[PDB]
Write a protein that binds this ligand. Structure first.
Ligand code: SPH
Lengths: 232, 235, 245, 235, 60
């Protein structure tokens, strides 16, 4: 035995940064997208989702990297000075911005990153922030149980396999700069890298296209292709 | 000189970072500290302090001094509860604005046992028994004494002791609960009932008021600092 | 193969899921009232049967004092011992795959996502049945809000063939007539609510179709017997009464 | 301060780099882990697990439960093969979507011995011998028993044992084969033939079904992680 | 069991201590003491009824 399995380890399997979200933030004269709130999850994309759903439970420290790409929108010769983007983390319960100049942007206790355009992509790390002892990719249950004494069925009605409505909060991204006379549109791509990963209860990989945050399937349910029984 | 490689994240300002910075006033002779009474080393020390609960939040009683008083009486309906509130120490209106709740609303997660102290402020000639019950979540919220009896509970004799301490132990599926209304991290319910009655003699007030206080125990802990929703600024 | 005695119930290869035996972590532990084999309602394996599925501990919600403890207490944990019995003659042929899936989330029948109701998601001891194809619910006015498992997709968007990654046992009528799986408590928490969360899912699929001699129609019984093991509950309060309709 | 020289590559984001980054939530009390059953330390552990093979992929049988069943019979043509498939554990349709193939399709290179377990699911009154052969690449794919005989092979008596394990050892010119169809890293062929026949008595089903499972051995290894082609997202 | 060697089946033999309804169904007899007996494997099954009585001696 001289061939090794260093690259098949769980840490190596997730050691790549996967894009999990693309957020559009526009700066223009203040129906608008001057600030964008994105709920944190890996299920907006399939690749990392499929890799993680190889297992039932996980525990990993995350690393987020933000790549910002700005462009003009129908500019004739209108130009702009280098922009600064504010990415504020809003955990469940904290107030959420209602405008791009709201008081919530003060970031007194909410962590925030101020990224200057043209610099290196903004990278930070997060520890395991799970309420339980491990993350639950699959939850075979509800959060509310409808009881006999409930006045109406909606009291106990809950989404299947949904644990909490506000899983880990949102990221609110704005352009701190005031509006230039010409519109500037930017895309922030968030790349998520698990680290120190531990996994439990392996599961078969998804074989059909994802349909929503659950195991629901709707279309393209015939994956295997035609092949002769005795054809090599 | 020394070859270096600029890693991603360079030239960013993270408000939670811990980096050394140049001093704008070097060689400054700072005033030495003194032993001022009341030094605080942790924020949970404040939460451990009992503070009165706005138990009554009716339209004509909230945002007054009557919102801290719960009326007890000998003429009350012994079948109905005295007071009832969910065990949400940061989202429940009766607990959110308490000192404990104020400290919690700066954090996303909380875990620990609570302590509710109920003080009877009637006459010394008034006597009675009160059943104070905590029901862990999962079942119907106790609407009767026969139900609240089945959960954790304590009987409080008004004549003997004017204050009762109902300790709610930490019993949770998750290691930490959220400081926001969530049916998955629901904490339970707290209810109060008349065990026997309030009995008063003649020439005594037949209606009295009780006060409620809430505190955190030494096992209490919070996690993931955040911004409170209580304070806002017009922009 | 050998005697299997638990409490006051005895059953005349057995696989331990993930190589872990059920174990304990003041939790209330009925050493006898709950540690015993409860027999579920028998199902009938025919030539046109697609499969069956049950959810644990939901299947034992009305089984003796185990269900009473489950409903009275707030949060409880329990391992299980599942024993599937299917006796056939030497001239019968077939094979059953018995899979114990942790967090066996199933797919719905409507375009709305995660819209399955609690009543339908918790069938109890009767369980449910897989289907050959995906039948989309068309009753917009009164959606059924029920699962639509697919046999070859395992009801979760994965291929049936890879389901053997889960703890499994094959009842092949030519060699064995019973299967036994010992499941420990598997969850992200040391203890969790049982009324709202199901820890395990038992799926029985007819890998090879049943056949007997040259008979057109043949059906044989399958009986599932589940023994809670090392079950402990905590958070005693008034009894929970779920709305099953 | 310290003179430094910015080397090429500065201010770049390589998604496979391993650099330290600032923590956005410092002094966070993470929930401690517990001993959850089923911990996985390597992805090849999953590949070592046997999983059923979609051996039959006909137009009217694929993407069903019939694609895992291969029909055996006493009336079958003993000269023709039962099943035949190339030893491509990541590109062959019958092996690509297996758990082994799913793990391989995340890597560019693979090397190791395979293990094919064939299970007979007929009556206990049915008996027969099956020749399971592996032919290393280079020659004609065995179209007859006289040819498959010449390569590696095993005889499997249905009556005695209902399952047979055909181990395909690692024999390759290169140290690693590609997980993509390539005639230079071709792995070989797997074929099955009737050694004698299936013999059944009266009152017994004359047609039966066999199942196939594939697994990796302890010598198995993969290299050069990549993105799988199985999962796609509409953009 | 005195059938053919080609006959197979499972039999549930149950003892129910007194106090409740006499088991009229398998779902009830299941709840008491019981043993499952596979006809194909063993042709004889021994159901032992242990001594469980309020009194030290019962009347004949
Ligand atoms: C500006 C600073 C940014 C701070 C960002 C903190 C966000 C915290 C989110 C951490 C975990 C998100 C992703 C991991 C959880 C998975 O979705 C689990 N499987 C939950 O089901």
């Amino acid at each position: 035995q001289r061939r090794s399995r260093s690259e098949s380890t769980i840490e190596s399997f997730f050691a790549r940064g996967a894009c999990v979200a693309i957020i559009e933030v526009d700066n223009e004269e203040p129906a608008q997208k001057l600030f964008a709130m994105w709920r944190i999850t890996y299920k907006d994309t399939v690749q990392l989702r499929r890799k993680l759903e190889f297992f039932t439970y996980s525990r990993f420290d995350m690393e987020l990297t933000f790549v910002v790409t700005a462009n003009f929108t129908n500019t004739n010769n209108g130009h702009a000075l280098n922009q600064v983007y504010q990415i504020m983390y809003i955990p469940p319960g904290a107030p959420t911005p209602k405008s791009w100049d709201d008081y919530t942007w003060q970031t007194s206790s909410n962590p925030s990153i101020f990224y200057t355009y043209g610099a290196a992509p903004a990278r930070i790390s997060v520890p395991y922030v799970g309420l339980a002892n491990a993350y639950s990719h699959f939850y075979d249950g509800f959060a509310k149980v409808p009881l006999k004494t409930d006045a109406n069925d909606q009291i106990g009605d809950s989404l299947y396999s949904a644990m909490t409505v506000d899983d880990f909060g949102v990221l609110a991204i704005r352009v701190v700069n005031d509006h230039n006379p010409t519109k500037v549109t930017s895309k922030v791509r968030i790349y998520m890298k698990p680290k120190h990963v531990r996994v439990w209860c392996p599961r078969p990989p998804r074989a059909v296209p994802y349909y929503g945050p659950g195991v629901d399937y709707k279309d393209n349910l015939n994956p295997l292709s035609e092949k002769g029984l005795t054809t090599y | 000189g020394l070859p270096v490689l600029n890693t991603p994240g360079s030239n960013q300002y993270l408000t939670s970072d811990n980096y050394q910075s140049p001093c704008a006033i070097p060689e400054f002779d700072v005033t030495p500290p003194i032993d001022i009474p009341g030094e605080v080393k942790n924020m949970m020390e404040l939460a451990e302090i009992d503070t009165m609960i706005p138990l009554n939040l009716e339209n004509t009683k909230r945002n007054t001094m009557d919102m801290y008083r719960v009326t007890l009486s000998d003429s009350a309906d012994l079948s109905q509860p005295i007071l009832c509130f969910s065990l949400s120490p940061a989202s429940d209106p009766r607990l959110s604005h308490t000192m404990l709740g104020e400290v919690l609303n700066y954090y996303t997660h909380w875990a620990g046992s609570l302590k509710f102290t109920f003080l009877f402020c009637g006459s010394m000639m008034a006597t009675g028994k009160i059943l104070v019950a905590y029901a862990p979540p999962g079942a119907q919220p106790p609407t009767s004494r026969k139900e609240a009896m089945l959960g954790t509970h304590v009987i409080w004799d008004l004549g003997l002791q004017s204050s009762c301490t109902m300790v709610v132990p930490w019993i949770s599926n998750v290691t930490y609960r959220q400081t926001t209304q969530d049916s998955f991290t629901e904490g339970g319910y707290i209810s109060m009932f008349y065990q026997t009655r309030i009995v008063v003699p003649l020439s005594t007030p037949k209606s009295m008021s009780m006060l409620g206080f809430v505190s955190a125990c030494n096992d209490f802990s919070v996690r993931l600092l955040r911004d409170t929703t209580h304070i806002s600024q017009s922009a | 193969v050998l005697q299997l005695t638990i409490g006051n119930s005895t059953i005349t290869n057995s696989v331990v899921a993930y190589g872990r035996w059920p174990e304990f972590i003041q939790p209330t532990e009925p050493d006898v009232a709950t540690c015993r084999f409860y027999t579920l309602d028998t199902v009938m394996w025919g030539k046109e049967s697609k499969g069956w599925w049950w959810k644990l501990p939901d299947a034992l919600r009305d089984m003796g004092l185990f269900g009473q403890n489950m409903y009275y207490h707030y949060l409880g944990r329990s391992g299980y011992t599942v024993h599937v019995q299917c006796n056939a003659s030497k001239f019968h042929q077939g094979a059953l795959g018995v899979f114990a899936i942790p967090e066996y989330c199933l797919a719905g029948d409507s375009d709305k996502q995660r819209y399955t109701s609690y009543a339908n998601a918790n069938p109890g001891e009767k369980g449910g049945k897989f289907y050959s194809q995906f039948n989309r619910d068309t009753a917009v006015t009164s959606p059924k809000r029920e699962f639509c498992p697919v046999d070859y997709l395992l009801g979760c968007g994965v291929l049936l063939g890879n389901a053997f990654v889960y703890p499994h046992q094959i009842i092949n009528l030519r060699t064995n007539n019973s299967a036994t799986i010992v499941l420990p408590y598997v969850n992200a928490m040391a203890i969790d609510s049982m009324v709202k969360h199901n820890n395990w899912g038992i799926a029985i699929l007819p890998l090879s179709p049943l056949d007997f001699a040259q008979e057109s129609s043949v059906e044989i019984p399958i009986t599932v017997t589940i023994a809670p093991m090392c079950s402990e509950f905590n958070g005693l309060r008034n009894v929970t009464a779920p709305k099953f309709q």
